[PDB]
Write an enzyme that holds these catalytic residues in place. Sequence first.
Site, PDB file in Angstrom:
ATOM      1  CG  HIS C  43      -0.557   0.430   2.425  1.00  0.00           C
ATOM      2  ND1 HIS C  43      -0.160  -0.493   3.363  1.00  0.00           N
ATOM      3  CD2 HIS C  43      -0.347   1.674   2.907  1.00  0.00           C
ATOM      4  CE1 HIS C  43       0.308   0.211   4.381  1.00  0.00           C
ATOM      5  NE2 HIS C  43       0.234   1.528   4.135  1.00  0.00           N
ATOM      6  CG  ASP C  99      -0.157  -3.812   2.965  1.00  0.00           C
ATOM      7  OD1 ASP C  99       0.299  -3.408   1.852  1.00  0.00           O
ATOM      8  OD2 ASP C  99      -0.499  -3.050   3.876  1.00  0.00           O
ATOM      9  CB  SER C 198       2.139   2.297   6.527  1.00  0.00           C
ATOM     10  OG  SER C 198       0.876   2.025   7.100  1.00  0.00           O
TER      11      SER C 198
HETATM   12  C1  6XS Z   1      -3.330   3.726   2.865  1.00  0.00           C
HETATM   13  N1  6XS Z   1      -2.900   3.702   4.272  1.00  0.00           N
HETATM   14  C2  6XS Z   1      -3.478   4.850   4.991  1.00  0.00           C
HETATM   15  C3  6XS Z   1      -2.896   4.895   6.404  1.00  0.00           C
HETATM   16  N2  6XS Z   1      -3.279   3.618   7.041  1.00  0.00           N
HETATM   17  C4  6XS Z   1      -3.966   3.513   8.191  1.00  0.00           C
HETATM   18  O1  6XS Z   1      -4.241   2.397   8.651  1.00  0.00           O
HETATM   19  C5  6XS Z   1      -4.427   4.750   8.961  1.00  0.00           C
HETATM   20  C6  6XS Z   1      -3.409   5.341  10.008  1.00  0.00           C
HETATM   21  N3  6XS Z   1      -2.962   4.234  10.875  1.00  0.00           N
HETATM   22  C7  6XS Z   1      -1.998   3.354  10.574  1.00  0.00           C
HETATM   23  O2  6XS Z   1      -1.350   3.410   9.530  1.00  0.00           O
HETATM   24  C8  6XS Z   1      -1.734   2.221  11.448  1.00  0.00           C
HETATM   25  C9  6XS Z   1      -2.184   1.991  12.682  1.00  0.00           C
HETATM   26  C10 6XS Z   1      -1.678   0.808  13.224  1.00  0.00           C
HETATM   27  C11 6XS Z   1      -0.844   0.196  12.384  1.00  0.00           C
HETATM   28 CL1  6XS Z   1      -0.035  -1.348  12.650  1.00  0.00          CL
HETATM   29  S1  6XS Z   1      -0.613   1.047  10.923  1.00  0.00           S
HETATM   30  N4  6XS Z   1      -5.693   4.394   9.613  1.00  0.00           N
HETATM   31  S2  6XS Z   1      -7.070   4.695   8.945  1.00  0.00           S
HETATM   32  O3  6XS Z   1      -8.125   4.293   9.906  1.00  0.00           O
HETATM   33  O4  6XS Z   1      -7.113   6.170   8.788  1.00  0.00           O
HETATM   34  C12 6XS Z   1      -7.302   3.962   7.496  1.00  0.00           C
HETATM   35  C13 6XS Z   1      -7.089   4.713   6.321  1.00  0.00           C
HETATM   36  C14 6XS Z   1      -7.256   4.139   5.047  1.00  0.00           C
HETATM   37  F1  6XS Z   1      -7.004   4.853   3.931  1.00  0.00           F
HETATM   38  C15 6XS Z   1      -7.650   2.797   4.906  1.00  0.00           C
HETATM   39  C16 6XS Z   1      -7.865   2.020   6.049  1.00  0.00           C
HETATM   40  N5  6XS Z   1      -8.224   0.690   5.919  1.00  0.00           N
HETATM   41  C17 6XS Z   1      -7.100  -0.254   5.746  1.00  0.00           C
HETATM   42  C18 6XS Z   1      -7.557  -1.709   5.539  1.00  0.00           C
HETATM   43  C19 6XS Z   1      -8.833  -2.048   6.308  1.00  0.00           C
HETATM   44  C20 6XS Z   1      -9.959  -1.105   5.875  1.00  0.00           C
HETATM   45  C21 6XS Z   1      -9.547   0.361   5.982  1.00  0.00           C
HETATM   46  O5  6XS Z   1     -10.445   1.183   6.135  1.00  0.00           O
HETATM   47  C22 6XS Z   1      -7.688   2.605   7.318  1.00  0.00           C
HETATM   48 CL2  6XS Z   1      -7.992   1.518   8.704  1.00  0.00          CL
HETATM   49  C23 6XS Z   1      -2.806   2.397   6.350  1.00  0.00           C
HETATM   50  C24 6XS Z   1      -3.325   2.440   4.908  1.00  0.00           C
END
Ligand code: 6XS
Lengths: 27, 10, 250
Positions: C43, C99, C198
Amino acid sequence: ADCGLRPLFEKKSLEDKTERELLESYI
Amino acid sequence: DFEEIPEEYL
Amino acid sequence: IVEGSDAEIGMSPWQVMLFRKSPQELLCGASLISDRWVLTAAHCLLYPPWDKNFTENDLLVRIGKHSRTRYERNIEKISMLEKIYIHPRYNWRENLDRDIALMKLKKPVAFSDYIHPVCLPDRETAASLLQAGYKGRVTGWGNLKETGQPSVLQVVNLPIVERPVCKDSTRIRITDNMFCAGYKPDEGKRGDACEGDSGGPFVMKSPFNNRWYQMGIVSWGEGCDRDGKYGFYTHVFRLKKWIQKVIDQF
Ligand SMILES: CN1CCN(C(=O)[C@H](CNC(=O)c2ccc(Cl)s2)NS(=O)(=O)c2cc(F)cc(N3CCCCC3=O)c2Cl)CC1
Ligand SMILES: *[C@@H]1O[C@H](CO)[C@@H](O)[C@H](O)[C@H]1NC(C)=O
Ligand code: NA
Ligand code: NA
């Protein structure tokens, strides 16, 4: 062959400040 | 926010 | 990294910063697995919901770093990418299943006190270490809170969580290619990865041979360090057949 052995730690037999927390969790 | 990196890398 | 601390010098010499060429900025975490291969989350390179689709020429990899923003002259090494390889079954549409991505460097990086590869687990190391309650270490230059930025590399130790507890914390479908980690609200300790971490490594120090193994890749979480939520990591061993296939070819 030398992976996961840090020059400033394992290679000098020096430990970092929190690696003991990890070891203690390995029951 | 990031300090400039040498031109050779760019 | 939320609720972590400053890394010690050379504490995580496999730490890699994925860096955007223009505008010059931190993109993701990553790890050094050999003198010419870097491991990250798919990602970090490909995410169509955010119009993210990088080519080799858009990126740089910065190895041996400690300070987030400063150019660490005579310490860090900046490398160009030869080729990016993304898992063909990476599921960006739903849950970031598989991923994982590999990046081959144009030239080998020279090892130093600050630059050294992490091991990848074999079946036995994964069976021995990937157990609920056993702690791993996550590192990165990402956000210190869900809603600033650190001056230096951050570190946090977190326990692997039981598969039912991971599943029960979210509405997202959790696969066998993922594991979750972090403290429960009742444990009275905190910590998590956040935006910018990430792609970074989740490491464990084998008590059998005293070597560091990368068991996970920072993948996603619902926000950062939220009570009742956990961090989700790509299960590195479960995708080793793909890692080996890529490195055997090319
Ligand atoms: C593209 N990238 C965007 C940043 N990202 C996120 O999960 C974000 C910020 N938090 C984190 O990165 C993490 C938190 C804990 C770990 Cl381990 S990584 N959390 S989030 O809630 O704002 C979020 C943003 C997003 F664009 C997508 C998601 N996802 C990821 C897969 C499951 C469904 C979903 O909504 C999520 Cl959970 C990882 C994916
Ligand atoms: C990503 O970009 C490449 C060209 O660099 C293109 O071939 C590919 O189809 C793109 N993928 C997506 C999902 O946008
Ligand atoms: Na075993
Ligand atoms: Na949490």
